Amino acid sequence: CGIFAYLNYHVPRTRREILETLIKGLQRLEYRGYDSAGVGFDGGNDKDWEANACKIQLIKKKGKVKALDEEVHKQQDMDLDIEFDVHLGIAHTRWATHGEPSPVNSHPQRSDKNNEFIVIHNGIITNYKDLKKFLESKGYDFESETDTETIAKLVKYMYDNRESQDTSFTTLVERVIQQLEGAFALVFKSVHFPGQAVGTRHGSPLLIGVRSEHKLSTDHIPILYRTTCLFPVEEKAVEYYFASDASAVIEHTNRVIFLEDDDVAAVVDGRLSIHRIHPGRAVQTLQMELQQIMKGNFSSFMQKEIFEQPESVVNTMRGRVNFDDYTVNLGGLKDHIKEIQRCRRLILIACGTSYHAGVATRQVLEELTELPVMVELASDFLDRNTPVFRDDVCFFLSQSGETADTLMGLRYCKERGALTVGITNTVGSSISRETDCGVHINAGPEIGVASTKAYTSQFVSLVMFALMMCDDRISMQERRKEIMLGLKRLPDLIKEVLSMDDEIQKLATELYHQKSVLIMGRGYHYATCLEGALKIKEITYMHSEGILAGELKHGPLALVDKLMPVIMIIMRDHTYAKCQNALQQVVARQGRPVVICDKEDTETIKNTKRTIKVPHSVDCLQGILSVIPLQLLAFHLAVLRGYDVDFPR
Amino acid sequence: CGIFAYLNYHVPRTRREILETLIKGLQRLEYRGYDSAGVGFDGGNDKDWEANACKIQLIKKKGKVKALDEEVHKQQDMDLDIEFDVHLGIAHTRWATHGEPSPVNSHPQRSDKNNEFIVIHNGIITNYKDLKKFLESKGYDFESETDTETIAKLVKYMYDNRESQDTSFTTLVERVIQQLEGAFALVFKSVHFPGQAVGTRHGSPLLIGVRSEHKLSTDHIPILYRTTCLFPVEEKAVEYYFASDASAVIEHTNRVIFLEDDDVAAVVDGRLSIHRTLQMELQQIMKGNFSSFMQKEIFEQPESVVNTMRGRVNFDDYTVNLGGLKDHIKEIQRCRRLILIACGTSYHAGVATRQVLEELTELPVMVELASDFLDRNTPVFRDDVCFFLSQSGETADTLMGLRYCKERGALTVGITNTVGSSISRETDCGVHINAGPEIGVASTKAYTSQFVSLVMFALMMCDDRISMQERRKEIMLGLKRLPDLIKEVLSMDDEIQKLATELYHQKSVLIMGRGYHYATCLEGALKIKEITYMHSEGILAGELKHGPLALVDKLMPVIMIIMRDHTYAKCQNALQQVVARQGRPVVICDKEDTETIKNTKRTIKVPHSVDCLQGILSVIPLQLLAFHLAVLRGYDVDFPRNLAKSVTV
Ligand SMILES: O=C[C@H](O)[C@@H](O)[C@H](O)[C@H](O)COP(=O)(O)O
Ligand SMILES: O=C[C@H](O)[C@@H](O)[C@H](O)[C@H](O)COP(=O)(O)O
Ligand SMILES: N[C@@H](CCC(=O)O)C(=O)O
């Protein structure tokens, strides 16, 4: 699930320091969930590091990384004070798929009892059955029920059947991946190629970080097919960081290379080259900081990411909104904003909360672009073979940028010649690369299990795009100004909503024992219902459902009685009167609902017992304020019930 | 709501023959509103019926009509033996969407403490608040909170300031409607005008039935402007039946006059004048041998399906011809998008046929909930084809969307089950699904008939594509076999009733499907909500992994739909995810799905049909399941709480 490897080339490091780096690397990957982890490093206790490069030691264990950290330092036959001028250590966290969690089934997987080759793997090898039969017929005995082991045994098969005594480590791996089917991110290590690393991916992220106090030969690595590689110029010293997630690299360096499918990256004599069976891979700078993946003073990542939303919203608008002259500029669309305006339809495709962001901005997109806006769930979009045309603009909302159904929707539309735009939050992700253009919502990494700041950052990003699509219309200047003053005031308004956290805990204690809750709303807050009810489902495990208010009299209103908890959303927009009508329909049937409304709606505050009173904003922005109380309610309910809000489940 | 009045002119009826005709008229209209009821007739106990038309009696009580039928009887003041030669009586059942359903709020309303004018109203007055303040200043005291009272206190204000001593009852009503705003259907009665009735409409149905053993003077009453009246030629014997619907009159006669907007009908001296045969058998509105309309309407779907295809599908030569579209089909193919607009179950019928509409028309298909369609002011264009699905043809939100689309030059199509309904008239063209009257509040045969209709339309849109000839043949053979396969499903009634005994106590249930059965699980979830009051929610199977799956444990009831179409494997993956969360689901599957039947305890095995027709079969069990669950919980399936049928306000 998580991969991290640390190669120090002519940068002296003691075995203690190497192990602490690997463990610290896995600590940055734990948030993805896992059941076991392991490390691989050169063994032996010969004081000269050059003689220990033929003994690979492994320490794998089922449990948390801490237990692994304890097992590392709990080795009597291991001297931690040996200094290695050159060394490659690899680490891995496992999410079991093939084989039950156990030390044997943990990574790194070895090629034999002498550990001539070891490999860490993220993904699944579909044809591991056949590959295992073939290697067993050639005389290789397996010890684990993991598909990963077939990789270790196979690379040794190529090595044992090499035509020349000096075939490259790269050539060996090329022959392995050419026999593999499915998805995989791999890092290899071998006693026969000491100090060298080989990384390759297909359908799984893999990146390489680099650091050196010396100048590097290039910032754009060219691809080599079967002056050209990356290395420090005047000296040898250099450090490489293979990782499946930037979060494990950023504290050491912000210079990274994102590998692409079928890339085979190799480090030989401290020089990094990328082979493939003038295109090149860029060495780019990440704007990510270690502080963005730490809880800080908060007790959970969920709490942090909700309460930091005044900051994340500001990070989303930075360099993109100019309140001094009411102009909007998404740099990611400069070379495509012209074509997009000559198109005839917008299609927003996403899963889960990302899809709700589409619903939350569909109206304002229709208002300002005057174009048809169709919001689709990616899985259903694929089932129906939806008609798509060359003059369609297709947005793909995805925080991770790797969600399969959304990604497959992306590739579907590209085949039909539509113009594709990625709204992502993960640099280097598949959806950010394969779209024609895109916007990075720059909300910072989302470490929590549920989407909190990503939903509101997507909300803001799509509103900003809408503002770009009508920057030439005289009749809409006023409307644009109204909206951008609302964005100017939004962060302060979000703080105001968070300052009512106390009022929300009271509501949580009132719903502590409840099993169902109906969340009602219409117009700009239809999405607020759905997203609220999804959060309370995902985090609290109670049956929260979002009900479009205009639909009550067509059936759903039958659930209302004096026992069914109800939360209604009644804001000061054009649907105010209609929402009041829905409230009367509920109360008329013995419903006693909790209402989320504007601070100054004196009428409903008096006639309704419990009301959450949020500040008034622009109609097409209220959704951001009205959803936060529901984020907090889901958070507090889970806490009251003893759940771990940072646990996937 | 419902309206019914009985005017017998020189046809001797005792006071019991009239009260049992008013109640029997409301029972025919009860399914339109059953929160309260009331009747209005002539009081007094004088043998000579003439000295009793100056005294009005109002018997109004809370509850269904059977609560009023007992309040009318066993009274100590009304002598049910007086013979009336001329008499008028008005009745009404109300849908109390607001306030309390008290006898004071029920209709008929009154204008003072002596009952000089009583009115029964179907609709809403959008300015009754201004009429209430104008009338309170002149010396009129109000009693109720309804908007109907402002119609009674105002018809008396025009009578207190007339210019001549004998102003016709029409003139008084003409002055009232000029001050009323919104929609309304009214039937007046006054002591000053004995035996005279006035019936005007504007945006709400209102017809007049007539019966007489004598010949009628004419068959085309001429509309007048401030050899003219409909009356028996030689004698005076005539019976009139004011009613907002045709079912309350078919039992007494099949000769009605469908009024129009702003037509002020008036019966004077037993002569019907307007100022400014029915094609239904009584059997169609009788439960027959079933204990409920909903059970009948479910088990009669084999016939209603056939009645939808009659004279429209030819299986010998595989031709589809919808007469209602012959003059527009050519222009519909030159359009560029399909939009389906509806509410509730009708909206589900759009979801259930969206995929096949996209396949056979190759056009974009967009399915919209009417209420949200209006809140967003959706972009619509002259080259859009907009369908409006409505069993009643009167649903307010759907109807407003129609007029919204006409204003934007779109080609509109009505898919209705009511001839003469607003939606069937105001659309450029349309199809009558011809399923028969639907009395049960929950739509059952209407859904499956709307389904078939949209499929027939799809078959027309592609009858000129060679490449789709085989696909057309496959679907039409499925239609030929569908009625019998529906019977095969209904034969599992007993098996469904059992599984209901295992769930009637639960509070929630999740229904999961994708593709062609996304609609199935939504419509099923709606039905269970509407008549069993369980918290049932439809969940798109593809979305489970994105949050809702967290709500599944060994306790949470789950129903899954897994059919043999292109999503079988994906549905199998969702089923494996559910079991991993310890779920124990009921699976609706195809009989030949042996793998599914072995590994799942509770299964409902339905016969295999064409993929785009399978939805009709997979939904019927949920219709039956909702029925049995309601019976187990002691509820009534023909009168669910908190609403009625057809949302016209
Ligand atoms: O609570 C929300 C979850 O995070 C989940 O619903 C998420 O929104 C989807 O899995 C889409 O993922 P992406 O946004 O990464 O595409
Ligand atoms: O089961 C519920 C009802 O059938 C309901 O969903 C109905 O569909 C709408 O209240 C109006 O729809 P029509 O306009 O077709 O009557
Ligand atoms: N399929 C491998 C790797 C899974 C992973 O960690 O992503 C296993 O189960 O061991």
Residue numbers in the entry:
A (entry chain A): 2 to 227, 244 to 294, 301 to 672
B (entry chain B): 2 to 227, 244 to 293, 308 to 680
Manuscript text:
Compared to wild type GFAT-1, the R203H substitution does not cause major structural changes. In the mutant enzyme, however, the side chain of His203 protrudes between Asp278 and Asp279, without affecting the orientation of the neighboring loop (residues 277–280). In contrast, UDP-GlcNAc dose response assays revealed an ~6-fold higher IC50 value of R203H GFAT-1 compared to wild type GFAT-1 (R203H: 231.7 −15.2/+16.3 µM; wild type: 41.4 −3.5/+3.9 µM). In addition to the observed gain-of-function caused by reduced feedback inhibition, the R203H substitution alters the PKA consensus sequence of Ser205 from RRGS to RHGS, suggesting a potential change of Ser205 phosphorylation and a subsequent loss of regulation. Here we present the GFAT-1 R203H gain-of-function variant and decipher the two consequences of the substitution: first, GFAT-1 R203H displays strongly reduced PKA-dependent phosphorylation at Ser205 due to a disrupted consensus sequence and, second, shows weaker sensitivity to UDP-GlcNAc feedback inhibition.
GFAT is a modular enzyme composed of a glutaminase domain responsible for hydrolysis of l-Gln into l-glutamate (l-Glu) and an isomerase/transferase domain that catalyzes the isomerization of Frc6P to glucose-6-phosphate (Glc6P) as well as the transfer of ammonia to Glc6P to build glucosamine-6-phosphate (GlcN6P). The relative orientation of the two domains with their respective active sites is relevant for catalysis and affected by substrate binding. GFAT-1 activity is modulated by UDP-GlcNAc feedback inhibition and via phosphorylation by protein kinase A (PKA).
